[PDB]
């Protein structure tokens, strides 16, 4: 969607991975304060997201969605402010329906343009929008009302379609938001990343600036994968340009998850100014090689071990876009290291897991 927002993919947290229903303001404006603290704000991530829970049952005598008195006193506004004055933006969460997945606040449909103009009002920056108790109607019908009721609003509100690849929203959704959810949710596990990232992988294609695919909120840092499987996700992602959405607990980060997400290298690959989706390209069993092109004629490639033990991986330069007589220096994203002069293919012995990311430069 043209609208100035998301030409590349948006970088940001949201509360929904680490904090799931349990959620209130205090904990939003501190989350906000160590994406500062912690840096993390001036490598690129921008959008704290607050998701599901935020808001009451019912609303007020005017219509408008109420903010959840016990656990957001000060307001939608105050926090908006509060993330503005951090340099930060603001995201909120509601549902193309009548109640919100979790049954704990109400949602927008029929409510479109009042909840966009209430939202603009506030100085939301961000919206996700959800697909539960849709009263049987069509992502394709409920989802542009909303696109519709932003554009209209005061503000520019970056949209974040979350229809979990019902319809197939690649097909239909560039004109109609900034990013689409193409699978079922993300889990803290192995074969939970590695899924989404597969599905996602065929609608490689349909994502450029303006509209991404969007295989859910990262999970690194919640201690349901390893370190190796950690790297993976985020080399992965990074390169499929998803969102990075940062979904552990900013406040109480692990040293090693902030080191796997602050790696700026791997950052420049997703934020890459050419905006091509990086895909699977090729598959030795569980040994991958997925690749893609970036600015400046180079190439984003990892060499990725899904086995369960350690492997050889050899990236073929036919397989990745490139003459085989070419030569290039190979970055290594997580080494910080370049290789001179390397010719026909790239190797490493990799752990279980683990993964190489590379980018490769021509001479």
């Not at 998301?6 to 209130?24: D, K, L, V, Y």
């Not at 539960?132 to 992502?139: A, D, G, L, T």
């Not at 520019?156 to 900034?178: K, Q």
């Not at 895909?279 to 990725?304: C, F, H, I, M, T």
Request: a negative charge; proline letters at 3%.
């Amino acid at each position: 969607l043209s609208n100035g927002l998301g030409r590349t993919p948006q970088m940001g947290w949201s509360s929904w991975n680490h904090f799931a229903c349990n959620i209130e303001e205090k904990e939003i404006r501190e989350t906000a304060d160590a994406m500062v603290s912690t840096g993390l704000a001036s490598l690129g991530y921008e959008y704290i997201n607050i998701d599901d829970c935020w808001a009451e049952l019912n609303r007020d005598s005017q219509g408008n969605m109420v903010p959840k008195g016990s656990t957001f006193p000060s307001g939608i506004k105050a926090l908006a402010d509060y993330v503005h004055s951090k340099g930060l933006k603001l995201g909120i969460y509601s549902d193309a329906g009548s109640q919100t997945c979790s049954k704990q606040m109400t949602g927008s449909l029929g409510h479109e343009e009042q909840d966009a103009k209430t939202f603009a009002s506030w100085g939301v920056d961000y919206l996700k929008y959800d697909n539960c108790n849709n009263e049987n109607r069509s992502p394709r019908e409920r989802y542009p009302i909303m696109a519709k009721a932003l554009k209209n609003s005061g503000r520019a509100i970056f949209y974040s379609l979350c229809e979990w690849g019902d319809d197939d929203p690649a097909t239909w959704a560039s004109s109609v938001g900034n990013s689409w959810r193409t699978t079922g949710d993300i889990s803290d596990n192995w074969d939970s990343m590695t899924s989404r990232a597969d599905m996602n992988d065929e609608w490689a294609s349909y994502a450029g600036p303006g509209g991404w695919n969007d295989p859910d909120m990262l999970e690194v840092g919640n201690g349901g994968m390893t370190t190796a499987e950690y790297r993976s996700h985020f080399s992965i992602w990074a390169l499929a340009k998803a969102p990075l959405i940062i979904g552990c607990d900013l406040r109480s980060m692990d040293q090693t998850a902030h080191e796997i997400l602050s790696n700026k290298e791997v950052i420049a690959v997703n934020q890459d100014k050419l905006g091509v989706q990086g895909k699977k390209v090729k598959q030795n069993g569980d040994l991958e090689v997925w690749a893609g092109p970036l600015s400046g004629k180079r190439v984003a490639l990892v060499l990725w071990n899904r086995s369960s033990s350690k492997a050889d991986i050899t990236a073929y330069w036919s397989d990745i876009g490139l003459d085989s007589s070419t030569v290039v220096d190979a970055r290594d994203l997580w080494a910080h290291s370049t290789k001179g002069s390397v010719k026909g293919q790239i190797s490493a012995s990799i752990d279980s897991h683990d993964c190489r990311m590379y980018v490769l430069t021509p001479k």
